[PDB]
């Protein structure tokens, strides 16, 4: 019966709600509602311990910047997200999310999470990306960004593939439990 609070942040449309929902309900948001404020809950077993994770979902749209301070107050772990089909979303990690998270949640551990790991090899994406001298984000890059911002760890996953999802939240819970 241990309680911890996890907050997810990142650019709009980078897959945060899908990751939370897929993890908390195994379902998958079909009708895509941009987020304003939501919270969910899930129970996770880690290293023998039962933990109840409160999952605070936030807006990626900058139009809602002023509401996000309302999710930070008692955070045990941050999932700081970008999307692998959007090297833009990655460059916003140091520019926007890391400065805000460090302001509101100093000393709160951060998991840097690359979402949509499946689309790394989808031509639709990988061609549009080529259409602008771009290409999906690469693990060395994600990992370098994680070292740069001081993250507790680096993790990659696909809500749709579902691959690695579980591993994102095990790592986050290990960080939450960390003194």
């Amino acid at each position: 019966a241990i309680r911890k609070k996890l907050v997810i942040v990142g650019d709009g449309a980078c897959g945060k709600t899908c990751l939370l929902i897929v993890f908390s309900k195994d379902q998958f948001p079909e009708v895509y509602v941009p987020t304003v404020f939501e919270n969910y809950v899930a129970d996770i077993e880690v290293d023998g311990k039962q933990v109840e994770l409160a999952l605070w979902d936030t807006a990626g749209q900058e139009d809602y910047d002023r509401l996000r301070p309302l999710s930070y107050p008692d955070t045990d772990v941050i999932l700081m997200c970008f999307s692998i089909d959007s090297p833009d979303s990655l460059e916003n990690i140091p520019e926007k999310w890391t400065p805000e998270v460090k302001h509101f949640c100093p000393n709160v551990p951060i998991i840097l999470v690359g979402n949509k790991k499946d689309l790394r090899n989808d031509e639709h994406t990988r061609r549009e990306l080529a259409k602008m001298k771009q290409e999906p984000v690469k693990p060395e890059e994600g990992r370098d960004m994680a070292n740069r911002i001081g993250a507790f760890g680096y993790m990659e996953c696909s809500a749709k593939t579902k691959d690695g999802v579980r591993e994102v939240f095990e790592m986050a819970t290990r960080a939450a439990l960390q003194a």
Binding site: R3, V36, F37, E38, N39, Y40, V41, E52, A54, L55, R66, L67, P69, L70, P73
Partner: protein, 131 residues
């Protein structure tokens, strides 16, 4: 309406709440109706609970001063929420809880409110959505 008349005359007369935009809200604005009222607990930032009369009209939070009511004065926050600026949500953690957000551009505020029962929380959430 009857209940509303008495609540009103029970409200202490010099009482007001500061809004984030620097305006004020005083009992006089209540002279200009009451949809439902109920006793709840307001969780402060430090995890303390404040006993509160919540009135859905906007949302208004009252504290008791013996047989008088005053506009709540909890952690420098406004005790009145405009319904047009209101975001309302279930506390996933707490079947009795709801989160009530004033999204005011002068400075948003969170209010985490706990009722006595799951049924009463869903009762509050239904009545709040209509407005």
């Amino acid at each position: 309406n009857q209940k509303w008349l008495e609540i009103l005359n029970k409200i202490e007369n010099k009482t007001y709440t500061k809004l984030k935009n620097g305006h004020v809200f005083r009992k006089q604005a209540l002279m200009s109706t009451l949809l439902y009222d109920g006793l709840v607990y307001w969780k402060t930032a430090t995890g303390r609970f404040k006993d509160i009369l919540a009135l859905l009209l906007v949302l208004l939070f009252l504290q008791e001063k013996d047989q008088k009511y005053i506009f709540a004065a909890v952690d420098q926050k406004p005790s009145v929420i405009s319904l047009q600026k209101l975001i309302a949500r279930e506390v996933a953690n707490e079947e009795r809880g709801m989160f009530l957000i004033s999204a005011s551009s002068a400075g948003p505020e969170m209010y985490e409110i706990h009722t006595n029962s799951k049924e009463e929380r869903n009762n509050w959430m239904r009545r709040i959505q209509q407005a």
